[PDB]
Structures are given as structure tokens and as C-alpha cells.
Amino acid sequence: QLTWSQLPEVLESGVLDTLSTEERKRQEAIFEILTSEFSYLHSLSILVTEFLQSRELRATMTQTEHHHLFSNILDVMSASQKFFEALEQRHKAQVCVEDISDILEDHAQHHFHPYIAYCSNEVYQQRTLQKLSNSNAAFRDVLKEIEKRPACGGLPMISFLILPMQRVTRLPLLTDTLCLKTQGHPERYKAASQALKAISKLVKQCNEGAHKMERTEQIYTLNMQLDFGKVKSLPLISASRWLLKRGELFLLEESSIFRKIASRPTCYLFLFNDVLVVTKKKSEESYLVQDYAQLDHVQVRKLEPSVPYPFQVNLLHNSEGRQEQILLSSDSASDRARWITALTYKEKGELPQVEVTKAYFAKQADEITLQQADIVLVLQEEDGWLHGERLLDGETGWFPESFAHSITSRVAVEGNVRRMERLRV
């Protein structure tokens, strides 16, 4: 609750009477990094004490399941503590802290490596929790009882496990504000900038690691599931191929006008960044490929209108070297837009800006996870869904428009745009 200005030691010193307002802000900026860091470190300790070190929870899982669930949280927690400790000594030593940029850069360059591993392991962590919740009875019971305990603060385990990822994404914002407020001293500003570059570099490494691990898992898992026996074999595995969107769609026939809303034939699409694969789902883990085509040679178009939201996918060069047209429909206007936006994947400042109001977690390959106060540029709006590019890292995704509110005041708008340029890769 207390701010640096309200801090008892700062009052007794009475440095307030003679101190530039910008410096008061630099000290509040440094104080925010330390105060935010402690709350996270405390939240990490709850995760370690109530969940990681729960013998009963370990008893419900296997030696291997525990590693995926919790990962190197002990290593990540240890990294956070040493960092807070360095910052704290500076805070205790003097009423007005000279610099913390040296600690910011040093830790990001040499001691923040655990975050990259922890962030990259998210794909496994998520699937491990889901498998445990859906099919492990013993797990569900024990976790609820731990969640009921007062220390968790009636926060669920998942929200603790996502905290390291959230902090590292916000570290550049806190360091940025410092750079803005360190402009007054020339020598310090350069060091503060050194920090943002190192801090922003670390986020890039964590973001890339998450993508490499997640796409590598998807390409191997999908490679087994897609059965290319009937058609000309296509090598799916590649270190470059990733999944744009997957989904079931309704097959449309022009032969019959009188369609039904029951027992409608369907097809399942896997759309990769460079290839579209048309399959028909046999099991939950087998899909029989019917055709495929390079995204260079795929056209998409809305169909003139029941079975609403129809669209036509044209394979100009198909698996057999020929041309084929697929007529599909979806029962969601927003869903059709997401398929067209993906299928046209190959194809500034006047971009409407929105600010996240409620944390949103991505449920699909299209979507982009967003936490509160994240800014997102808006690219397309359809049926209550916004296709947008995250201001912090440039990642683009869909999310419901209900989680954000329009920012119209230019002074804010152009501030975020000028601010995004500073952290732009």
C-alpha cells in the first residue's frame, strides 16, 4: 500500500522539500520494481510450500509428472530471491537509491537463465495439469483441499504456476519506466538503457524458447496422428513448420439445397504455416489425410448465402498437381473469420488501441494469451472477437473484445506507440 513518498524513513530525512519531481518519480520507479518483486517471491514460496512440497500431491503423480507440472520453480524462485536481495541492500543503505540499473542488467544477462527453461516448458506443464485433472481422481481431490487452505489465498494452483511467465513479461515495462525517469542524469540513463536491452533480450529468449518447444511438440504429435497413407506422402516434420489453426468444419454439397442441422458430414483441417492439410477424423488420435496444398496455392473466399457462414477453399495446386475446390460452412461468424484470417496468413499508428481489462488465456492456436494492462493493437473485429497484435512483443492472436476497452485519447495512444518502438525487437 505505502509508496516511497509515504515511507517513514523518507519523511524523517525530509528530502521531499528539495527534490525535483522527476527524481521523486525515479525513486518510485525503483521502489515499484522492489515491491513488485517481493510479492512475486512470496507467491512463489506459497507454490513451493503448499504444492511442490506436498507429499500427498506427489503421491497422486509419477516421478515424471511432477517435473513437468512444477519444472525448475525452485531455480526460478532462487533467482528471484538473490535479485530482490541485491535490490533490497540498495534500498536499505540510502534513503534515495543511486542506481539499480547495474543489478537489472547483471541478473538478466547472467542469472535469469531459469526463466527461459521455465517458460519453454509451459506446453508440457499445461498438458500435464490437464491430463492430471481430467483422468487422475486422487489428484483432483487432493488439489481442492490444498486450494481450500488459507495460504493459497483462494488462488488456484494454475495462477501460481503462471506467475514467473507474467513477471518476466512485465520486467521490461518496469525497467522502461525507470529509463524514462532516469533521463535527467546522462551517465545513469545509458546504464538504465543497457538494462532494458538486456531485460528485453531475456524476454525474447523466453518467448522464442516457448515457441520452439511448443511447435516442436505439435509437429511430432501431429506427424503421428496425420495418416498420409492414401495420398502422396508429404514429410510433415521440419524445424520451420508450425500450426496456424486446427478445427472441424461442415462439408457443404451444392447437389442438395435442402440441408439439415443433424448428421452433417464434416472435415478436419490442419493449417500449417506453409501447407494446408485436409483430413477426416477417424479416432481422437488418427486423421486420414484426404488432400493437401501449399499455402502459396490456396485461395479462400466467403460463399454467397440454414447452414450459415459458408466459405470456399480452392487448392490451385493440390497433392496430385491438379486443382480442387472444397466448400465448407461453420456455425460461427467469428469462426469463419478466424479460418479466412489464418488461410490468408501469407498475404503503424492509425491502428485502434485497446487495453486489456480482464486476464485472458489462449484456448487455441489462433488465440494470444493476455494479462490485465497489456495493450493490443486491433487488426480485425468479428462477432465479439478481436484479431490483434500484442503491443509488448508483437505476437498476434484472437481474443474476445469483452476483455478490453477502447483507448481513444491520442496522448495515451501515441505514448504507447512511441513506447512500443523503444522495446520493439
Q: Which residues make beta-bridge pairs with 276? A: 271, 293
Query: Do the beta carbons of residue 52 and residue 68 sit within 8 Å?
Result: no
Give dist(CA 414, CA 391) in Å, integer.
12
DSSP 151-214: TTTT--HHHHHTHHHHHHHHHHHHHHHHHHHTTTSHHHHHHHHHHHHHHHHHHHHHHHHHHHHH
Give dist(CA 140, CA 131) in Å, integer.
11
Count of residues in the chain:
425
Query: Do the beta carbons of residue 389 and residue 376 sit within 8 Å?
Result: yes
Grid-cell match 512440497, residue found: 53
* Residue 117 cell numbers, joined: 527453461
Query: Do the beta carbons of residue 366 and residue 245 sit within 8 Å?
Result: yes
Architecture of domain 353-423: Roll (2.30)
Neighbour count for residue 80 (Cβ, 10 Å): 25
Q: Which residues make beta-bridge pairs with 271? A: 245, 276
Query: Do the beta carbons of residue 217 and residue 239 sit within 8 Å?
Result: no
Neighbour count for residue 196 (Cβ, 10 Å): 22
Give dist(CA 218, CA 277) in Å, integer.
15
Breaks (C-N over 2.5 A) in the chain follow: 305, 347
**Nearest partner of 189 among 22, 416, 17, judged by Cα:** 22
Query: Do the beta carbons of residue 251 and residue 266 sit within 8 Å?
Result: yes
Q: Which residues contact 155 (CB under 8 A, 6 or more apart)?
A: none
* Residue 159 cell numbers, joined: 495462477
Grid-cell match 485461395, residue found: 299
What are the Cα distances from residue 416, in Å, to 193, 388, 389? Answer: 18, 15, 13
Q: What is the CATH number of domain 224-344?
A: 2.30.29.30
Give CATH 2.30.30.40 domain extents, the chain: 353-423
CATH H-level superfamily of 4-223: Dbl homology (DH) domain (1.20.900.10)
CA-derived radius of gyration, the chain: 25
Give CATH 2.30.29.30 domain extents, the chain: 224-344
Query: Do the beta carbons of residue 400 and residue 384 sit within 8 Å?
Result: yes
Give CATH 1.20.900.10 domain extents, the chain: 4-223
